[PDB]
Ligand binder design. Sequence first.
Ligand code: ADP
Ligand code: ADP
Ligand code: ADP
Ligand code: ADP
Lengths: 408, 408, 408, 408
Amino acid sequence: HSEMTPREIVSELDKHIIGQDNAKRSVAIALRNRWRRMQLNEELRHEVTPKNILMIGPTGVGKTEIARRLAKLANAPFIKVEATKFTEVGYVGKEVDSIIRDLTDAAVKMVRVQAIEKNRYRAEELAEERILDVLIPPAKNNWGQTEQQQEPSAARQAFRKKLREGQLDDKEIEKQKARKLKIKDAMKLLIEEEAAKLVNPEELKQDAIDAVEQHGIVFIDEIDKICKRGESSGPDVSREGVQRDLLPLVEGCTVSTKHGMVKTDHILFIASGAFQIAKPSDLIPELQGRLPIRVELQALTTSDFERILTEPNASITVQYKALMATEGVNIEFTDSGIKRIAEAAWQVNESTENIGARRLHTVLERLMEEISYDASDLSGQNITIDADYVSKHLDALVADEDLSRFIL
Amino acid sequence: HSEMTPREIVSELDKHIIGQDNAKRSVAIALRNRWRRMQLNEELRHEVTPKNILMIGPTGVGKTEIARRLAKLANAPFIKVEATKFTEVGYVGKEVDSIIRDLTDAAVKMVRVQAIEKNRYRAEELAEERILDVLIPPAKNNWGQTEQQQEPSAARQAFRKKLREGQLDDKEIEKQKARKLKIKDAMKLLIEEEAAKLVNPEELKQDAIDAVEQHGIVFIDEIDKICKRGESSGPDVSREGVQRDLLPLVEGCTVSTKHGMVKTDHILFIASGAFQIAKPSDLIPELQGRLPIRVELQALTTSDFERILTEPNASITVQYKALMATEGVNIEFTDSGIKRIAEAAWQVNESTENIGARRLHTVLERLMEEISYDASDLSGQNITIDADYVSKHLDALVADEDLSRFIL
Amino acid sequence: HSEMTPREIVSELDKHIIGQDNAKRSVAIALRNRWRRMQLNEELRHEVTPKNILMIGPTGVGKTEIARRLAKLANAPFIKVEATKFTEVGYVGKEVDSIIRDLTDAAVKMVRVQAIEKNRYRAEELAEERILDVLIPPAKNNWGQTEQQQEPSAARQAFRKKLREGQLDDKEIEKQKARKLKIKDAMKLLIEEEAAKLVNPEELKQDAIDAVEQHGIVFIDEIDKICKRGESSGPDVSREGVQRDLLPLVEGCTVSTKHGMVKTDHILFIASGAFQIAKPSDLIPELQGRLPIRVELQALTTSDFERILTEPNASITVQYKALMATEGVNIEFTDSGIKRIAEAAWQVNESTENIGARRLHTVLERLMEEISYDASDLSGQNITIDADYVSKHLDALVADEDLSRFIL
Amino acid sequence: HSEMTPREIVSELDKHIIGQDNAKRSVAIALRNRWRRMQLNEELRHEVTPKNILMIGPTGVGKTEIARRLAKLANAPFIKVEATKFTEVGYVGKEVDSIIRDLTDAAVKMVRVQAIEKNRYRAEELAEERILDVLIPPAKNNWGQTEQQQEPSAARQAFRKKLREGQLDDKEIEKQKARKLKIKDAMKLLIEEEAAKLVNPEELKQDAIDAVEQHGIVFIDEIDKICKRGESSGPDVSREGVQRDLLPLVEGCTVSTKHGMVKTDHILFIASGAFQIAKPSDLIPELQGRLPIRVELQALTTSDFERILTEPNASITVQYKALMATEGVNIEFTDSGIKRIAEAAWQVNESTENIGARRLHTVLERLMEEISYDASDLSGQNITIDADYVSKHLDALVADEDLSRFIL
Ligand SMILES: Nc1ncnc2c1ncn2[C@@H]1O[C@H](COP(=O)(O)OP(=O)(O)O)[C@@H](O)[C@H]1O
Ligand SMILES: Nc1ncnc2c1ncn2[C@@H]1O[C@H](COP(=O)(O)OP(=O)(O)O)[C@@H](O)[C@H]1O
Ligand SMILES: Nc1ncnc2c1ncn2[C@@H]1O[C@H](COP(=O)(O)OP(=O)(O)O)[C@@H](O)[C@H]1O
Ligand SMILES: Nc1ncnc2c1ncn2[C@@H]1O[C@H](COP(=O)(O)OP(=O)(O)O)[C@@H](O)[C@H]1O
């Protein structure tokens, strides 16, 4: 669908993810190819399959984010499954077909929500006619003048303009209704009925299928945790089993959904792994063939952290300012206050367990717990978060390691 | 169905698979036999059963491809199951019947889509009459001169000629419809509207059964993974269990599908293995019997790699050219460039893990990563991928083994 | 149902199975008894139960064949279950009731198919009247003369005789139809409608029950693999469990089928075993009581092989000739060519793993792979398969043992 | 239900079981108590519960037979479950509730078949009037002399007398029917047609519940196999688990059947064991309590064997005679022949494994194998099975032990 050049995609991604340009390019080329395919002929459209990608990189450095934003960019159905979820199917577990079912169910909860959008205007623009037709019961046989109807568009208008706020005035209208419920309510009930009658139920569910088959995006997390390891053998078979199980989905097959028969031949797969224990070459051969694209994502630096704190759109820092404004408080971070927040996050990560960027959210939240509570009682003020404030609210905690494993 | 001779079958198969002539003939004898059977009497038709085949060879050399093109060439329902998918059902898992079920759900998701092809002219011919009737509401009871309702085909033929792209003119027509609408919709609402009339149920779903029973092709990958190996015993009975479970399917039985009652007695089975650990004679007696045909496939050579790169119809190289064309970019591969692409693929396979022709897809794909991204900013150019280009892009990757286990 | 003397049964069996006369007599007496019972009085009909048989013999020597032919002789529902299938039910597995369910489902796919037989004549003899009544629309009020109707049996006949081949002529007829579909098609659609309206749906499914309860034949393969062994203990319980589980089915009980409540009191059971590890006396006592008949089947000799190759009806040799004729090739086996084919089969069996008669199919197929392919391009010829041809196509393979474990 | 005294019950039971008088009385006291209860007041009817019995004895001596004839003699629903059938549900398997379900599905497959007996005269009396009405279409509104529609019973009584075998005369009658047909069908189509009218649902299915609740008899074989043995502990809790699971059933509870809601509080339970390993006191306390009656059965003696051979009603010997008669063959057993048949049966049991009276069925059956096959070619003869015959046929088999473990 999208007509964005790979370069235009990366640009749009740059709005939510810092660095990891290579991984961006990789994900952009994949999208661009879905367009490139439709430009081909009958034959070549069956042959060319998705160029599935395998992202290799440490925890919390942007792999899922790149995927989510990529799908959210192409308004595509997106599902994220943790590969290891199926390790236990050997004894009893979710079937691997479920991935495509759940892909569909959210691809439905999606096409259905984005239906309430177009049917939220005309859904209540023809919903007024209802309430109005009982405030100015139309003439006995309107007079075809295409303007003789828009006549009250005098009397009529008056009720429309007075129905722009001052309503709540009890009435009665019409399985239609025929009841005598408030206008604030008639209006409400109406939102539904008129909206629904405007929604083609069959093409609705048939469209979710169209989505999954055409723009589906499955992100298999930690696929490296289902590769063979020199620790034992019993598990390896099941681990490997999950690979064989996943095989048809990425090779091309048909799964049964309670909304219809979906084909996976064109879903795009983004596999993810840390690959510290196993190596991509440890995936079964059939799978390595289906993951032609390989890209590494680098670990984040403190400079990366600083930027992630303020640069993205709706970055967590911006979000805080937004939320505090709701309370009437003007929050402001100084360059050093931010340099220092990032600094703390890197410290707990090096000091304890490295959880990537995720660490900024916990540090940031611990730092604002004070303001967050007081906010309301602090309305109309200009609170500034600088190096001092930061250092005064994190240092002690950050320095105390055992406490860090609990509180940050 | 097809009246093709084996020789013509192999020929047709040569358009997609390089080498593996013996497997080609094996699989071709199989198809021609289905024909040979229908040319027989009552008794002999029950007696004669498919000559199931056992393909023996290393990964990615054309086993599945051969079987997939065979299926495609006989418009036959095809399913590919991984044998170990059931080694776990001793603890829970998919029952082997699922195979015939899926081969049915896809033997349906097939007859259905191929009913949209046959009925794609009905809604845009003897059904586009919907808009034209609300455009020029036919005479009060047409007269009748077998050219009288073709007379207009002046006033009429004008609305049809003008209906070659000019729409978005809202009208209305007719649970038929009635509802007022446009044409980018009254027309499309008609696309499906008039179509579900010709396609019925007890024939569409009745025929799927007919297909599976008569032309079904099951490909059982890794059959060798469920033979007995001399390392333990507990897992062996599980393995042999899958063999016993599969027994009813290839010996002749009845399975229950939510579309009817399928009879497997004439499904063609192509089993597949590598047989490095086990040997076909490790299969249970009853299975070896039902697997009369044995054929080996050779490993691929660098020459086969060169040939696979360009000879097949819609070869990866050809597809690539096509895709870049979408960007207004003329890509070109010189004989030496291809010679080196194959060379690299062979190197990595020999130095790391051998994954057959699969390796070509990842090598080729990495080689092009750059052009694929810049394609949009190169429109109107003639990029040549020669030996130089190939070397500058793949040398360093292939040279570094650990790197290859990740990036190639 | 059948009125054949035990001796007449064995005779009819002799048409498909070589030797194993004792096992024949055993299976014949069992059938004959079902008749003998119905000749008894009210009381004695409940008392006399089936005389279940336990066939003891090496692999592939005719045990299943005798059973299949016995059932196919009495047009009885026949099911073959592998006893070990239920060993895993301990952890999760097919219930043993399934045996009687599946018995029923195929006893249905049976009574339903044999319904299309009687309703294939009158199904299309009253289906013509349909197509004809629109080619010679009957008089306005036919004139009751029982011959005044068979009048056109002038005009009328002409269309009938011209409807013996030259049809395909578009028409229209009548949820009836009322559509305007081709006669080649009207005719087709008609085959269904008229046929169906001719089938009593209730007595249909109620008859399958009647079949299973009255002529059911369950062949439990490898029951010896669920007897106790001096290898362990844990399994023995489950192994033995399967015996307790099977117990009610052969002792007399009621199972629930999705087509109705079926009673097993009169199904005939034929258990099968090799009994190399266990002995029949190792079955639990309750079971040994229900298997009053014991018969051994001898291993096959080369003389047995030679005869099995040409003597049965629709023997594999005959089948080949049949299939090759389809191609216009006259195939002929000389007495020595056959003596030699059998000789090879015995050799691979002694040399490698002995799979009984099954070995003839693989040898025979390997031997004809050449002709089978060329057939078409060999039309109109008289190909003879003698000792030379045979020896030239098998010797090398047979002599190479390791190759035999793969290719033969 | 039955008003039989214990003494009369035992008497009636003596017609099928040799010896085991104590078990007879135990089981007889049980039946008479059900009667005794209904002769009581409100309170005492809830309080008084079945006196469940625990039968103790070696295989095949009459435990089940006794319990089966008891059930049969009180036209009571009967089910026989093998206790270990649930020792595996700790990993999966049938829940103990299935017992009451099955005892219901058979308490149905019983009331249904016994509704075809009561209604087998209705379709061939007040329903055979269907054919006679199309034979002599009754007067335009019968007059009315309570002998006027009996007047014909001349023209009428002629069609009824002639309808004593003379049919195949096609007519038609009346979703009633209408469709033209024959009589080997209009008549039979009437058999069921008029019958489903008298039998209703909410009484037939309502009564099954009534039966089970009031007269249900559960026979739990091998109860001793789920007691605690001193070899391990893991399997013991599983065993004791089945005991706890069975507890609700014999203590009083409600189970859910797809036919209604069954109450077990008055189901009679007959548990069964051998008790060589465990002793009844190994059963859990709550179960011993609910198993108030304890009775032992003795092992059978050669004399019991002779007696079992001929005394019971429809004894195997009698059945045999009957079956051979079907062939026009008069079979005869002399006192010494029988003495030797029993002797042989005892020998094998003593020399190999003891399987009680069961052994008689297999010995007797082998002894007759020859006559059974040649029966048809011996019509009109008097074959005597004397001591000589017996010896010539069984001596060699019994003498060879290994042979007996297979053939006897
Ligand atoms: N490169 C990045 N740019 C912006 N935010 C990032 C980046 N890396 C991680 N994050 C933040 O950290 C969280 C970590 O999850 P995610 O980004 O999915 O990566 P991973 O899949 O490797 O754990 C995300 O919610 C995201 O907001
Ligand atoms: N002989 C061949 N000719 C053409 N393509 C081949 C050949 N062998 C392998 N391939 C390519 O490699 C992939 C490997 O899969 P496949 O051919 O099914 O073999 P395998 O069943 O051994 O995995 C396929 O996508 C196919 O396009
Ligand atoms: N005695 C025989 N006569 C004819 N064909 C036989 C005989 N024994 C085996 N066969 C052939 O070999 C195959 C072996 O299977 P089967 O006959 O079921 O015996 P088993 O159950 O012992 O394996 C059958 O399909 C049959 O065609
Ligand atoms: N005392 C007996 N009287 C008559 N028949 C008996 C007797 N004991 C055993 N049998 C026969 O042997 C078989 C053994 O089963 P059963 O009598 O139920 O005992 P068990 O419950 O110990 O197995 C039955 O078919 C029955 O006909």
